Amino acid sequence: MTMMDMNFKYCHKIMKKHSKSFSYAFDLLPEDQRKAVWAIYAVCRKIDDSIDVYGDIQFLNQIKEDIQSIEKYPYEYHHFQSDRRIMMALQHVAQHKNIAFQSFYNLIDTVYKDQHFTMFETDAELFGYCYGVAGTVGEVLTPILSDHETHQTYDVARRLGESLQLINILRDVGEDFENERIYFSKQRLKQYEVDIAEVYQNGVNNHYIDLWEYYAAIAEKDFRDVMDQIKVFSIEAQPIIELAARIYIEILDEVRQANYTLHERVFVEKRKKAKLFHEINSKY
Ligand SMILES: O=P(O)(O)[C@@H](CCCc1cccc(Oc2ccccc2)c1)S(=O)(=O)O
Ligand SMILES: [Mg+2]
Ligand SMILES: [Mg+2]
CATH class of the missing domain: 1.10.600.10 (Farnesyl Diphosphate Synthase)
Incomplete structure (x- = not known):
């Protein structure tokens, strides 16, 4: 098992835990595709939970930054501020698939409002x-x-x-x-x-x-x-x-x-x- 796989496994672990339903469904997809879903799910989960349970906008900025970092430089090593594993997996997904960054940005803007x-x-x-x-x-x-x-x-x-x-x-x-x-x-x-x-x-x-x-x-x-x-x-x-x-x-x-x-x-x-x-x- 290569390290990148390790990062995807962490994403999966996260998905398994927060959603038995989606985990149950998506794990049925072929390899490349579920890996991508685990990563994207993990990213969103961190966002959602960095405010719906750990109410902390500092982290949310950490995540919002890492992503902008990826969108900006898909092919450079980054020292992500929030959760290195997930971002590495996301960055890996983005170097193969088209990603709507603005969409992660809307989610972020959105969970922010869930503060006040x-x-x-x-x-x-x-x-x-x-x-x-x-x-x-x-x-x-x-x-x-x-x-x-x-x-x-x-x-x-x-x-x-x-x-x-x-x-x-x-x-x-x-x-x-x-x-x-x-x-x-x-x-x-x-x-x-x-x-x-x-x-x-x-x-x-x-x-x-x-x-x-x-x-x-x-x-x-x-x-x-x-x-x-x-x-x-x-x-x-x-x-x-x-x-x-x-x-x-x-x-x-x-x-x-x-x-x-x-x-x-x-x-x-x-x-x-x-x-x-x-x-x-x-x-x-
Ligand atoms: O709007 P809520 O009540 O915070 C709802 C989470 C909404 C944000 C979210 C979190 C995790 C995943 C997610 O989007 C998915 C859903 C399925 C597969 C991948 C990602 C969206 S939750 O009740 O499941 O926490
Ligand atoms: Mg929530
Ligand atoms: Mg809910």
Whole structure:
């Protein structure tokens, strides 16, 4: 095992831990491609967690710098300020694949704002946040999971990304509330006459469930739309992307089964991930 492999293994390790779902799906891709996904995932994870758990903008600048460093000089050795392994893997990926640096930049700009947090007045802002945090990830991943990096492919990957993030938010209401963050908009929170702090105490109700379903409705609709357009992705990527998405979208049924709980992070047992893997691999 060469050292560069060591760095990719560290990226994988990170992905395995923070996302059993995506890890479960993407590891099915051929070597060169999953390596690229591990690295890109690790980068994003460091960004996200350098603020959603280690709330530290200093690091975030360390990472933002390393990347600009790579974009600027893909073929020079750098003494990265944040996490050498991940950057080395990313830099290695970039010397082979096209990378949308601006996309990592939008994510960064985005998780920054998650410092002095302020609710969203409208779903539009909610939706734009889904873009900066996920749509942009779909955009960085596009050159990796596709052959035709065209407007249509970027646009689908992006929507996939935004949809997967809406589901993400649909599961984490409680977790997010404990952390002092509500992502449903006030417009929509008022319209449905619901208070998160109040539901958190006395439990769900129908105001919440309806509201929760309003969003789920959206998420699922966009999910179906992207599945239709799944062929914009490579043949090998298609089933994996589908499993990644169905494995993630299944989370909605899990929030339901647990009665929209605000005190647990529901999940999809690895055995169901296997079941879904099954129902899809037939089709392929
Ligand atoms: O918006 P949130 O609630 O912080 C959400 C993370 C969003 C940022 C993020 C983190 C890690 C990976 C990621 O993008 C991916 C997703 C799949 C594969 C590779 C990268 C996006 S999390 O709930 O999983 O932490
Ligand atoms: Mg987070
Ligand atoms: Mg979340």
